[PDB]
């Protein structure tokens, strides 16, 4: 069963919502079992991504929300089926009858929409991912594999018992993982569905990579990042060692984000209460048969945009104006959110452009092992008795 | 303290009996009451569920008792198994994927029997 | 869903071996699936062969080191295929040949009890002759 | 192994039948280990019910069973057209389990 599950190790939110700590370790090591374990049905992504829209429309408040509003302005006029019913044209108030008769949609039936602004306050907040243990609630356990070659699926037979979670921090980020828990032996490789080309798969590392986003100045709002190469170097290298040795068995071709909107194109994280999309097309190059662009310190030019696209819903978000003084922004790159675009049959290469955008599947590497589980404590055996 | 319920899974039943009597017999400002109350918020809800099972075991005459002897005798299409396969050829698992809807009927002549 | 798609159907010459191929398209892998093989003599009932619950390869007791199972996880451009190994082609053994799926999730499903399973969907099944 | 036996191995029945198929054990399964099968000549296999007493999805709302200690119950309500299939009845409860023997039905 799947229930809601509480909150939280150690002045807004977490003081509402949340426990205090737990003296940790509480574990209970279980034997010959098989417990089988699936990440990509799991629900505990759901209750999450909802908890951290609870997170962040209370603790980093916009000034303007720009939502939708697309509603069925007077009149249920569209009634149960059929055709012939009118509607808009002039202004929003003229006739437009439409034929149809087993309906599709217009504007399956119709919706007009709209767009709810909606202006918040704005006091400038501060902001620090604080270690999250999801703590379960009474009559319930959370199963956790200890496998470190776990690929999601597939069932794992050290299985151990907690009560409560380890420690989860609210990083938001495209294009790239910040600030998660790493590997113990090697790196891994998933998907939801290999060959099928459209899910995000995962690559969680086991080198702490680091990176230091910073603002100099002379700009207002330019900024920058540095990552050690040869470090990087080891790190894609290792990566296509992995992706040469089980899903092709064929040539490698890194690349950027092919386009859309630009959240995707860009790191996004936000540091600080500022929403850094940093430049991502020089770190991904590594076309390479397995056997000039600053070569030492290498340099993500970034930008500080304050009009962003939500992640929490549809639409755009206006905060704050902009900071002043310099952000230090020094974080840990864990992992990697890439695709594919399998094909075509003369290559023979496969170009293997990132993707993200998702922010549930940033929660599926930090949810990793863990399973919801409704313990039955009553049973019935027939005996002698006596 | 209902966390190590659990231990003695993938074992045989024998075995987790014996595990079950191993461990039991084992075991100034806003912000102080703000993590003070959610400590008693879930010591009241452990208590209040354990409670609930026990008056649960309590309605079949099996108030306390970990392992009670009640007064249902069989039906002989309740798993006709000799007692040695009961106790060592399997475990919880196969015995609560294999009787529920009698589990179900179980519960019912339990109550019936209970009242009389 | 699961179109469960097998290889061509043959002809066989006494005394030989043959891998019969079967491909699962729309499984997520062997872990939480599992691959059961049934056979079907024409015009009698059918017959149970083999299993890779777990990874763990076993055909059964009474048809023994003839005929052995191996299985494939999805790679690449491959999705999940599992083949089936005969040795020592006899003239009886002339048959149409089935590869099912089951799920292996949850454990209170009722599909499956400790490897003996009823069989969620089926092949298209590949005759066997001899000549 | 445990044998089953299907009974009756043959019938015959017009459009809109109920027909009541048993099948023999010759242990007594309690927990219901039994499954349905329907087989058109020439197409998969298909599975009908599993667990005695629990419908597939892909299955319309048509077919049932019930359990009597060492026999099985098939039951097809309101027998159309495309449901003129050779059934089977797979025991699956003991290591390896066995199916049934056929009933083909016609009108």
């Known amino acids: 069963a799947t229930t809601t599950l509480f909150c939280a190790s150690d002045n807004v939110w977490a003081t509402h919502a949340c426990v205090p700590t737990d003296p940790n370790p509480q574990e209970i090591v279980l034997g010959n079992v098989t417990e089988n374990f699936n990440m990509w049905k799991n629900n505990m992504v759901e209750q999450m991504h909802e908890d951290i829209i609870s997170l962040w429309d209370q603790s980093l408040k916009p000034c303007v929300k720009l939502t939708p509003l697309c509603v069925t302005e007077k009149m249920e006029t569209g009634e149960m089926k059929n055709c012939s019913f009118n509607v808009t044209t002039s202004i929003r108030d003229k006739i437009k009858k439409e034929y149809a008769l087993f309906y599709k949609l217009d504007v399956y039936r119709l919706i007009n929409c709209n767009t709810s602004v909606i202006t918040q306050a704005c006091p400038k907040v501060s902001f620090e991912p604080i270690p999250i243990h999801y703590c379960a609630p009474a009559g319930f356990a959370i199963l956790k594999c200890n496998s470190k070659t776990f690929n999601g699926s597939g069932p794992c037979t050290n299985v151990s018992t907690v009560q409560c979670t380890h420690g989860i921090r609210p990083v938001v980020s495209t294009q790239l993982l910040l600030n998660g828990s790493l590997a113990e032996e090697e790196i891994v490789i998933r998907s939801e569905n290999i060959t099928d080309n459209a899910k995000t798969i995962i690559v969680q590392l086991n080198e702490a990579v680091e990176i230091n986003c910073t603002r100099p100045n002379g700009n207002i709002r330019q900024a920058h990042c540095n990552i050690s190469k040869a470090r990087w170097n080891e790190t894609l290298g290792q990566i296509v060692a992995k992706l040469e040795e089980q899903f092709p068995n064929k040539t490698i071709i890194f690349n950027h984000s092919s386009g859309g909107d630009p959240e995707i194109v860009t790191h996004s994280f936000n540091c600080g209460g500022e929403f850094f999309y940093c430049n991502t097309t020089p770190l991904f190059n590594s076309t390479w048969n397995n056997t000039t662009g600053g070569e030492q310190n290498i340099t993500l030019q970034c930008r500080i945009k304050q009009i962003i696209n939500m992640w929490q819903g549809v639409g755009k978000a206006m905060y704050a104006p902009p900071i002043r003084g310099q952000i230090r922004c020094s974080s840990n790159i864990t992992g990697l959110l890439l695709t594919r675009d399998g094909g075509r049959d003369q290559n023979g290469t496969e170009t293997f452009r990132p993707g993200g955008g998702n922010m549930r599947d940033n929660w599926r590497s930090e949810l990793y092992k863990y399973k919801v589980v409704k313990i039955e404590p009553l049973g019935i055996a027939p005996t002698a008795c006596k | 303290f209902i966390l190590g319920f659990l231990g003695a899974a993938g074992s045989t039943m024998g075995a987790a009996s014996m595990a079950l009597t191993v461990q039991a017999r084992l075991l100034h400002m806003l912000q102080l009451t703000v993590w003070g109350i959610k400590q008693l918020q879930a010591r009241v809800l452990a208590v209040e569920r354990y409670l609930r099972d026990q008056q649960l075991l309590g309605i079949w005459g099996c108030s306390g008792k970990i392992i009670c002897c009640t007064n249902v005798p069989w039906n002989d299409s309740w798993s006709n198994k000799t007692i040695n396969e009961i106790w060592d050829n399997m475990t919880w698992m196969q015995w609560e994927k294999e009787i529920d809807n009698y589990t179900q009927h179980i519960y019912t002549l339990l109550e019936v029997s209970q009242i009389q | 869903q699961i179109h469960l798609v097998q290889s061509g159907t043959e002809v066989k010459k006494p005394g030989s071996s043959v891998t019969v191929s079967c491909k699962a398209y729309g499984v997520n892998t062997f872990g939480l699936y599992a691959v059961n093989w049934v056979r079907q003599a024409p015009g009698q009932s059918l017959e149970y062969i083999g299993q890779?619950?777990?990874?763990?390869?076993?055909?059964?007791?009474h048809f023994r080191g003839r005929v052995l199972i191996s299985a494939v996880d999805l790679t690449g451009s491959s999705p999940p295929i599992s083949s089936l190994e005969i040795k020592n082609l006899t003239s009886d053994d002339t048959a149409v040949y089935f590869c099912?799926?089951?799920?292996?999730?949850?454990?209170?499903?009722?599909?499956?009890?400790?490897?003996?399973?009823?069989?969620?969907?089926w092949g298209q099944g590949t005759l066997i002759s001899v000549s | 192994d445990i044998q089953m036996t299907q009974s009756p191995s043959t019938l015959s029945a017009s459009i809109g039948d109920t027909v009541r198929i048993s099948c023999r054990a010759s242990?007594?399964?309690?927990?219901?280990?039994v499954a349905w099968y329907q087989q058109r000549p020439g197409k998969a296999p298909r599975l009908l019910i599993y667990?005695?007493?629990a419908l597939l999805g892909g299955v319309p709302s048509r077919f049932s069973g019930s359990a009597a200690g060492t026999d099985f119950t098939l039951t097809i309500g309101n027998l159309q057209a495309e449901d003129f299939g050779t059934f089977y009845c797979?025991?699956?409860?003991?290591?390896?389990?066995?199916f049934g023997q056929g009933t083909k039905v016609e009108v």
């Open positions: 099912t799926t089951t799920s292996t999730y949850d454990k209170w499903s009722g599909l499956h009890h400790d490897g003996v399973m009823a069989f969620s969907s």
């Open positions: 242990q007594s399964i309690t927990g219901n280990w």
């Open positions: 890779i619950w777990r990874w763990k390869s076993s055909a059964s007791h």
């Open positions: 667990r005695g007493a």
């Open positions: 797979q025991q699956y409860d003991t290591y390896p389990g066995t």
